[model samples]
Target: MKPYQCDYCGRSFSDPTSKMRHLETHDTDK
Candidate 1:
């Protein structure tokens, strides 16, 4: 797991799966 930052909220996730899932908040709009 790496420290990945979320562009919208400035929150960080330690795992790739968590980071990707966090981005899902925008998937419905896309």
Candidate 2:
């Protein structure tokens, strides 16, 4: 499955938007 990888946590997700939201938490430093 084409899982989306979160650049911040290096985790995979079934949905792209899910990672975008997850990035919001870890990406706050930026």
Give the TM-scores of the predictions, in the order they appear.
0.56, 0.49
Best by TM-score: 1
In the range 1-30, model 1's lDDT, one tens digit per residue, is: 557878887888777687888798558765
**lDDT tens digits by residue: candidate 2, 1-30:** 788998657789888787878877665776
Give the Å shift of residue 25 in candidate 2.
2.4
| Cand. 2 TM to true fold | 0.49
In model 1, the Cα lDDT at residue 1 comes to 56
- Model 2: residues with Cα > 4 Å off, grouped in runs: 28-30
